[PDB]
């Protein structure tokens, strides 16, 4: 009858990442028997925060390289110039990212 | 062909609100997609393991919160906990 129009619960949570897709992936990923209502909201918020942090640091590195587009080296620099992000992505190799420019001081 | 979903449009929506005039290459978008899937499976595995440790059948936002607090190092965990908490509190009043 008076069926209200659909609002995405991403927009209800004020988020950009999909709460419904995160809920479906939790529900199909064999993690538990049940998934609460606030769990995909919380998880989509955490994933959006981490994405925003890395993209903003990589955009700052791209602007410091006088460039407009973010390439994998910009992500490599943004992650490896950061103690907490380097500890998080410790056993992670980024393709086409290169290395940090580290020369040992005794050689100079 | 199959549908082959990803996080690319969502990473792009986040990118064009942290830097409105900055693009991203397709290889860097693939790396961000791999990052989001990796952190998803890491947090979901830790929350699953917590719910199995405490003999619970349901993964809730409290399990997601303590999995975030176990997995993220330092101030990263504190700001992710504040973001997840404010998203849940403005979701419940809606």
């Amino acid at each position: 009858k008076a069926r209200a129009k659909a609002k995405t619960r991403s927009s209800r949570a004020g988020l950009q990442f999909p709460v419904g897709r995160v809920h479906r992936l939790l529900r199909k990923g064999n993690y538990s028997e049940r998934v609460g209502a606030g769990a995909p909201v919380y998880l989509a918020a955490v994933l959006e925060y981490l994405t925003a942090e890395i993209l903003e640091l990589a955009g700052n590195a791209a602007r410091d390289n006088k460039k407009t587009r973010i390439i994998p080296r910009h992500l490599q620099l943004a992650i490896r110039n950061d103690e907490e992000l380097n500890k998080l992505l410790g056993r992670v190799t980024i393709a086409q990212g290169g290395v940090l420019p580290n020369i040992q001081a005794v050689l100079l | 062909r199959s549908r082959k979903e990803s996080y690319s449009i969502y990473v792009y929506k986040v990118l064009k609100q942290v830097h409105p005039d900055t693009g991203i290459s397709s290889k860097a978008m693939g790396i961000m997609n791999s990052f989001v899937n990796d952190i998803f499976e890491r947090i979901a595995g830790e929350a699953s393991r917590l719910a199995h440790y405490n003999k619970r059948s349901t993964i809730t936002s409290r399990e997601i919160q303590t999995a975030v607090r176990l997995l993220l190092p330092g101030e990263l965990a504190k700001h992710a906990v504040s973001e997840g908490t404010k998203a849940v509190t403005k979701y419940t009043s809606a």
């Epitope: 942090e53 110039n81 103690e83 907490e84 | 330092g74 101030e75 990263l76 700001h79």
Partner: single-chain antibody, 229 residues
Framework: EVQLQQSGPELVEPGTSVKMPCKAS????????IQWVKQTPRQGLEWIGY????????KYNEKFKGKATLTSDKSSSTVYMELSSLTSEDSAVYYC?????????????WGQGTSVTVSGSMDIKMTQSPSSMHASLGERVTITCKAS??????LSWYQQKPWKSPKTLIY???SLADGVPSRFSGSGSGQDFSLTINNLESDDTATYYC?????????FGSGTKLEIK
């Protein structure tokens, strides 16, 4: 807890150079930048620069290129600061502040202060519209921090009692710092920002600063001195 032990005052001659330590304790030393702030009582608070001891990476304000040199020591958990070519304007208090590498984090914990006593257009102007106001013991106080450019939410609030180090009140324009009661509340985004105290007390008599850290030269506010009967 987190303590940034900083040395006592110096009474030095012009043309010389002064080092000052910021020996930090209570946290993992390489996980956090150490920022440096000059406080002259003619220009308020000014950001000098930082070192990040994880990779010894520095960044300086353009007003202090060549004047300041920041070094670190992982073994002693200490950050030093060179002050070359001392002049009459280099007579101030030099704070060292603890800041995470997180973009929304702010100057969390401050040093005691080092009183050194001698013997620019593309920056963001932070305009606090009340310079001083008077208050009762329970009424409402609202302070604005109108900004020049678009910082998104990277604005933080500080209170400084006289002859003391600043204390962090609010970070990320809304979030309360640790140990700060809910009487303090922040609002706004973009260029309009606000600071609000609900139940005024005796210890709320201080100078209230706003700091932006959205763009790479960090700028403070002019300050707002609050007198409470």
């Amino acid at each position: 807890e987190v303590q940034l032990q900083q040395s006592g005052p110096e009474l030095v001659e012009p043309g010389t150079s002064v080092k000052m330590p910021c020996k930090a304790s209570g946290y993992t030393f390489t996980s956090y930048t150490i920022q440096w702030v000059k406080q002259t009582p003619r220009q308020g608070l000014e950001w000098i620069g930082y070192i990040y001891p994880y990779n010894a990476g520095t960044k300086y304000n353009e007003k202090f290129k060549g004047k300041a040199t920041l070094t670190s020591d992982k073994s002693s958990s200490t950050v030093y600061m060179e002050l070359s070519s001392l002049t009459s304007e280099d007579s101030a208090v030099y704070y060292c502040a603890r800041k995470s590498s997180r973009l929304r984090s702010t100057l969390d914990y401050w040093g005691q202060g080092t009183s050194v006593t001698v013997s620019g257009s593309m920056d963001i102007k932070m305009t606090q519209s009340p310079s001083s106001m008077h208050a009762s013991l329970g009424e409402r106080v609202t302070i604005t921090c109108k900004a020049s450019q678009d910082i998104r939410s990277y604005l933080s609030w500080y209170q400084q009692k006289p002859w003391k180090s600043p204390k962090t009140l609010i970070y990320y324009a809304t979030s309360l710092a640790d140990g700060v009661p809910s009487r303090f509340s922040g609002s706004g985004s973009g260029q309009d920002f606000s600071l609000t105290i609900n139940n005024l007390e005796s210890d709320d008599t201080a100078t209230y600063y706003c700091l932006q850290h959205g763009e790479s030269p960090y700028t403070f506010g002019s300050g707002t001195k609050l007198e409470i009967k």
